[PDB]
């Protein structure tokens, strides 16, 4: 019927790895900064790690592990691996620039059309990979999407993922609990808002109770400053009520690269392209001897 799931779940010692400092916390637990140095290997990988204990808890880390560790593309974040400690630490590729939420509010004044376009591309090839491995991830947003290097995006949190947040989902969704790929274009077409927008909070000061009759009466999120009618109607497509009627991921990936070509004709953001954004061709741009990013260490 469906096919083996031969991935591998690699087993990290304590002692292989160190806590450098604390990233981010919340009701969850806290995401620590780290290095890791395996066995005799004379490499150093840049890693985030993801930390009270229960035997519920435990399943539901153990689970997202699974599907992190089921998953390898480019704009995805894979699991490195997994420290088996009295409350189970998974072990990630470090992202510096962190989520794109914080990082499009931060750096707005030197985002220009081509990053926007750019990760939108990317967003809907790490999507579109998810729909090939039969994967609904039921929490597309942007602060769900991190930055490697600004020129560098990766879809994150599978805590949701299968084979609320209300203001992203899915009118389906919202309504009836149907979750699809077409579901998660909806929450797409969203993360695209929440980035033309540099951030901004969709339908801001309005409850999520008033959300499902909003978008029952045909309301949607506004155009950004930012979009012309060609990139707005792409949004707009995304949150169809009929989901047969919203693009593909496959498409997305076609209609954002056909205007990543020409980003001035499909965004006017003010003083464009005289912008400026970190690359790995910086002066201190990244002990740091031996140290080798994850996406080009492979295998024990
Ligand atoms: C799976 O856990 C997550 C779910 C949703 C969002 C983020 C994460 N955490 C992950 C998971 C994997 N790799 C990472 O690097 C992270 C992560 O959060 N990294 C991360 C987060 C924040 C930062 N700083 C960026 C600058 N800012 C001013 C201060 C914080 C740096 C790295």
New binding site residues.
Partial sequence: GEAPNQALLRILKETEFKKIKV??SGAFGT?YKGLWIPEGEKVKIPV?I?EATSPKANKEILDEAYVMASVDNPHV?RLLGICLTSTVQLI????????LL?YVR?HKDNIGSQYLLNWCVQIAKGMNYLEDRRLVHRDLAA??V?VKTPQHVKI??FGRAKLVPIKWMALESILHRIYTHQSDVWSYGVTVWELMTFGSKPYDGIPASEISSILEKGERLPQPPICTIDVYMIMVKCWMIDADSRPKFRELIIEFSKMARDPQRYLVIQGDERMHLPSPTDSNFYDMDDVVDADEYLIP
């Fill in positions: 990233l981010g995401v985030a993801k974040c990630m590729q470090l992202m510096p620039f962190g989520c914080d931060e602060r769900n991190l994150t949190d």
